Amino acid sequence: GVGTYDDFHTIDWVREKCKDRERHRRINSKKKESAWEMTKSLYDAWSGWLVVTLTGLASGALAGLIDIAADWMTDLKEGICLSALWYNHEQCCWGSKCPQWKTWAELIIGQAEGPGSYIMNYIMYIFWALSFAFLAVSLVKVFAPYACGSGIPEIKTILSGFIIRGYLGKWTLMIKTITLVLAVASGLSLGKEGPLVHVACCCGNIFSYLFPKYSTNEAKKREVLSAASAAGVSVAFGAPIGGVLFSLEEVSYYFPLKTLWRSFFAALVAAFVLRSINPFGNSRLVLFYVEYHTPWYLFELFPFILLGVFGGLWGAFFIRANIAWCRRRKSTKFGKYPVLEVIIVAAITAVIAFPNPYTRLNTSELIKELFTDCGPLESSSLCDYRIPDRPAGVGVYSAIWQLCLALIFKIIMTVFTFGIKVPSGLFIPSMAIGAIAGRIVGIAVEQLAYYHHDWFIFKEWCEVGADCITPGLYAMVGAAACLGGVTRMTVSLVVIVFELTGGLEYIVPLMAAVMTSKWVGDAFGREGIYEAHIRLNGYPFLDAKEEFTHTTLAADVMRPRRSDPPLAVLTQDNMTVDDIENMINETSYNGFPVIMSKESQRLVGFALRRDLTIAIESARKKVCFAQLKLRSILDMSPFTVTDHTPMEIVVDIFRKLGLRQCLVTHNGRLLGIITKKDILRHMA
Amino acid sequence: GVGTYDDFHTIDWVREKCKDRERHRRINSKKKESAWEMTKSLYDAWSGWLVVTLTGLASGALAGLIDIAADWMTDLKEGICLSALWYNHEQCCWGSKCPQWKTWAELIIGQAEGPGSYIMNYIMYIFWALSFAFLAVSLVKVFAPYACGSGIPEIKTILSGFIIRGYLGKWTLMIKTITLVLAVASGLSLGKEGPLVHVACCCGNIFSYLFPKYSTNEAKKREVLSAASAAGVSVAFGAPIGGVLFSLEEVSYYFPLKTLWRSFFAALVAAFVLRSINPFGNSRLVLFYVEYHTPWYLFELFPFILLGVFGGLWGAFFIRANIAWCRRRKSTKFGKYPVLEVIIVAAITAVIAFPNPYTRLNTSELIKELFTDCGPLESSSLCDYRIPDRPAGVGVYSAIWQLCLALIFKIIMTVFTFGIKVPSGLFIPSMAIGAIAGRIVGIAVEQLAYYHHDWFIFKEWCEVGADCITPGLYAMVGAAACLGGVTRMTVSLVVIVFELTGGLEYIVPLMAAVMTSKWVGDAFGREGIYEAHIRLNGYPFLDAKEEFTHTTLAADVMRPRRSDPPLAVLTQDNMTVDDIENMINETSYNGFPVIMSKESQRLVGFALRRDLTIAIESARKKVCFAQLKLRSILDMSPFTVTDHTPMEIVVDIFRKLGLRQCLVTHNGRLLGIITKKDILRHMA
Numbered sequence A, B: 001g002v003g004t005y006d007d008f009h010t011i012d013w014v015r016e017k018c019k020d021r022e023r024h025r026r027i028n029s030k031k032k033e034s035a036w037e038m039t040k041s042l043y044d045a046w047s048g049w050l051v052v053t054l055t056g057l058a059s060g061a062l063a064g065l066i067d068i069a070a071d072w073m074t075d076l077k078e079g080i081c082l083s084a085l086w087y088n089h090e091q092c093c094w095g096s097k098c099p100q101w102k103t104w105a106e107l108i109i110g111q112a113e114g115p116g117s118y119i120m121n122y123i124m125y126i127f128w129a130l131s132f133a134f135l136a137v138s139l140v141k142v143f144a145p146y147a148c149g150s151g152i153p154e155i156k157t158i159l160s161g162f163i164i165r166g167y168l169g170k171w172t173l174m175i176k177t178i179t180l181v182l183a184v185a186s187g188l189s190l191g192k193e194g195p196l197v198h199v200a201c202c203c204g205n206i207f208s209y210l211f212p213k214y215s216t217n218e219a220k221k222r223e224v225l226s227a228a229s230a231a232g233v234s235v236a237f238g239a240p241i242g243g244v245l246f247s248l249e250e251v252s253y254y255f256p257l258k259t260l261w262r263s264f265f266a267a268l269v270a271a272f273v274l275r276s277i278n279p280f281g282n283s284r285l286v287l288f289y290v291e292y293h294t295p296w297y298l299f300e301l302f303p304f305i306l307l308g309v310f311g312g313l314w315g316a317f318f319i320r321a322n323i324a325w326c327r328r329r330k331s332t333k334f335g336k337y338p339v340l341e342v343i344i345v346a347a348i349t350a351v352i353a354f355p356n357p358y359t360r361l362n363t364s365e366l367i368k369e370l371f372t373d374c375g376p377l378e379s380s381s382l383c384d385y386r387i388p389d390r391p392a393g394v395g396v397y398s399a400i401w402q403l404c405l406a407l408i409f410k411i412i413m414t415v416f417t418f419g420i421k422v423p424s425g426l427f428i429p430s431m432a433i434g435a436i437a438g439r440i441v442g443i444a445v446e447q448l449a450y451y452h453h454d455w456f457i458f459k460e461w462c463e464v465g466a467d468c469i470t471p472g473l474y475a476m477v478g479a480a481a482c483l484g485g486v487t488r489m490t491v492s493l494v495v496i497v498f499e500l501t502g503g504l505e506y507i508v509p510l511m512a513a514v515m516t517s518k519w520v521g522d523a524f525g526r527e528g529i530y531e532a533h534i535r536l537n538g539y540p541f542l543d544a545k546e547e548f549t550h551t552t553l554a555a556d557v558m559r560p561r562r563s564d565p566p567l568a569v570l571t572q573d574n575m576t577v578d579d580i581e582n583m584i585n586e587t588s589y590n591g592f593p594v595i596m597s598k599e600s601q602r603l604v605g606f607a608l609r610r611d612l613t614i615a616i617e618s619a620r621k622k623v624c625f626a627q628l629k630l631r632s633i634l635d636m637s638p639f640t641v642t643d644h645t646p647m648e649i650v651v652d653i654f655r656k657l658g659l660r661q662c663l664v665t666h667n668g669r670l671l672g673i674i675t676k677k678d679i680l681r682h683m684a
């Protein structure tokens, strides 16, 4: 009964460490007496490996299920394969102009060409997009309201020591997976990679319920969740080392460095499970695992920086627009119509997604097609090529028009969608926009060299009769730069990109563009998109990048103030159960120091509301607190700090040890108490 | 003047953080006034990259110089290349039974064969080994007494916040490098890999002196040293990721995770400098960089565990013998004759090193020859081979005799040498002993399979007419297991091994053997050899693996005790210059709290002996301390803790924040002070 934390609060880690210490002492007491005790102790010890192992296995299985369901469903938007209903379009196309894969215009109208078939397929596409969007939103609203958003803000807040009982419950796993599948099915500008971490996290949570050790102790569950975060990111990107570094960089809040092997094993197990699972015959770990064998030139360095500016500048734009819109939509009438709003957004997407050739295709496949340079058998309009430079046809102008319109779409439509009550991620929109910009700049530079190759800056670099530029690397660097400039990741992103796409020959432009994008972005708000999303949520995140301009002390922050009523404390002997009931009913606080008497106001001990309550009605069902006596249940060694302390040290202590609140006393006379929420309130 | 730390003490990190904050405020006050201050600020910001870059570059250059010099010296121990004096035997032999590479017997006697030449070469080998040993010990004794030991324990203590002014001085770099070269030249059971980190560290230190930001600041220099540790380990082993993972695990004490990129870049820079530098034409990054393309069988798993036991047991044995001997040699007359002791040890080495074929050769080359399996052109006695199993000749028995004698010599002599007043390391002896044991077990299993292949346990796995076992992998796993079992490294060691020896097909047995050896070793002392030396030196290391059995409080450790005189404190108004001077001269303490008056004994402020003294003579050259007045110089916000605090929380705060000492007060009445040394003393 003691030690339970109310939902929507912050954990106190040192008490949890003391609980673990007493549990360890109890285990050691009976450890060596019998072989059965030894077996139990070894099982408890191996539980540390077991939680990570089961979490990784479940994360891999869930990722496989989600991937197969998602690609299957998003394939249904186009047509069906009569011969094999269970397969998708590409399985039937390769399972041998694919007659066995029919569309709906031919299915009903019987015509595969002409305005009529085009209109029929268009109207169907809108209809099916609406159906998936509506059903996903209805399911999430009815069955799980915490599937919203991406899942990085909430997880970051959870690991720091926050509590959200339902955000990782047994129920949210099923609903989250189903609605993520059905949301990525609709083709909305939202991914199934990043948010999958949440799913991974859930695994840990659920399995942590089976072992008592990691359930009662909050810090142990937090460590398991920090491991599951790396496992989930590794599954999402197939970057186990990137996944481990991700938890340290932008997810985990506390790291004793003794669980790094746990995170590494989690990322290995989850990746292994994901790659092993391929029932339909798929070979790639992820849909868009690509490899390169193309070179790049030193003179080619100048344009990345230019692109880097975009990869950064867009960041500043995005984090300045969506955050604004995400605010406005939460205050105007529009926030009271979730289902209708998401229907409208998805309808706008589909209506302005099918006509454009690129957007009609799932965003992962668009990213792939932008990654790969024109293949020997490639004959798409993206490579409208018919002299030192290769000739270009008139169709390149049309391709540029179509692709620039696709960019102008993907940049706008993504801003409005991340604040919807359905699963969504930002990795995919960022990657896609960056890759699109990269391809644009690559084509532009190729044409510019073609027209004016006679200049000295070009004749000595570009070879005659051969390609001089590699737009695939431009797409890669653009994607990485935009992702870095939106979510302000520099090293974890580079590691994940390296693991996703093998080949060390491209690390230099990637690092250059990422650093340039970060530099540009920091000038327009040094907080990542996830940081500012937590800010909008108002969650209690204790930033490790703030600076105190004023040389102020806790004297200005210790509560109460001259304009606030006095704090509530407790006495030992003169006070009985009835007074305790009256005080508890007549006050709405959480923690109470205990003092000898009112006149002295000298700090003696500390206690919390819920222990005091449960204890008093337990005693009533079945008074002096100093040396019936209730001294034992009263904690007597609370952490203190000198009242004249500078605030910076107090903040550092809270961040390092993880104490929800600390007292503040003068000459031994208790004065005030400071909690994380108060520190954040003064942080404004 | 204020803030300087006396040698052989521990740093207080929070005051250093406050100094960093005030410096940051001072720099910010004038950041935007003109472009010149902007340039200065950017230079200060880039200083963080600059220190690591210069440290890595210098470490690489020094490692290259040391490697070439060590090869050249240890090569002259055998003979000389008359045609080209500067070259070594290997280059001269490859520069075309090598007539241009002459030996001593031919040079003087003129005959390359017969007992006479054997005796001449043997005696000259002993003489030259004595010459190198004597010169090395004389140089280290005369010019640098801190080059002793390996250098890992001292570095571990330095990063934690210890101070040793001379252990990294401008002078110790030259002497340390020279004597390490001349010591590895003698061929003693000691390597130039591990200790090179010390050299790397020095670089950092020295170059840190050029930037005021990183010089006056202790914690910043500690971060630079933690980076240089990874850089040095990377240079020694050619494992940049290995070095970065090593710094966190067994070297660094504090890591804010914001310098991990610094350590990673230091490792890359150092590795690049090392590989680039090869003036004599060498291509390998290290002497013994190897690659493998050999398979292994699952049924082959059983003996690794057996070998693991050895790799474990030897660990326990070694850490139980040397630590004992290193104690005895420091308390008996033998400790007053350093030069003669090292002469005796080197003489024993050389005299009992040449007759055995393996020990005659430098230990790195022995490790290489044990790593590589018999090549197609190999015809050495190690491969005495002339039916399902390959026939074995009589020479295998003689090879086994010689190699077991070599193992006995290496296990025996290595114990006595690590406590000598010359540069030495444990990586090389551990690797060599483990590899030797691995090769022994490999040959034994091959012979067993040859003799008793008829059993069902072999016919199902070992093919006819081809080799069934790979002793090279056995040597690799033995080396890794012994190193893990002596130095108690599990993950950093395995990553370093992977980087040193490419190929992921050999991670499973490495992990198995390392884990088994660690399990076996922990049963015989859970402290690594490096930890055991840090203990024996008595340095103030605050272990993060101890457990308090008694439910004791700081009330048990607050000083003074009933049996000790009272603490020295200071008044503010009634005191003057004469009284404070007399009190300072009459006491030998380090910290002094300041109180209103003797009767009250209420904590008010705190100060230090050295700061107080410097302030006193400064004031006298050119009294009230409360609100001439010396209030300002008196610190007024010292960290405190409640007297009834459990000791565990106090230890945790010291380990986390890094405070030398904390006061302890009751009811606001100051009672005592607890410092790291006192906590360690009660840790006994």
Ligand SMILES: Nc1ncnc2c1ncn2[C@@H]1O[C@H](COP(=O)(O)OP(=O)(O)O)[C@@H](O)[C@H]1O
Pocket: A559, A560, A561, A564, A565, A566, A567, A568, A589, A590, A591, A661, A673, A675, A676, A677, A678
């Ligand atoms: N009017 C007040 N008078 C005295 N103390 C106050 C007053 N208001 C708030 N406090 C102190 O601030 C704390 C509330 O901070 P907060 O973190 O928001 O909630 P909690 O303390 O439940 O975590 C209380 O525990 C209390 O000690």
Ligand SMILES: Nc1ncnc2c1ncn2[C@@H]1O[C@H](COP(=O)(O)OP(=O)(O)O)[C@@H](O)[C@H]1O
Pocket: B559, B560, B561, B564, B565, B566, B567, B568, B589, B590, B591, B661, B673, B675, B676, B677, B678
């Ligand atoms: N006899 C004593 N009476 C009161 N205090 C003592 C006594 N001996 C030691 N102390 C306390 O212990 C501290 C010495 O601890 P130690 O860490 O070994 O040295 P330092 O304080 O110089 O680091 C002193 O600063 C002092 O406050």
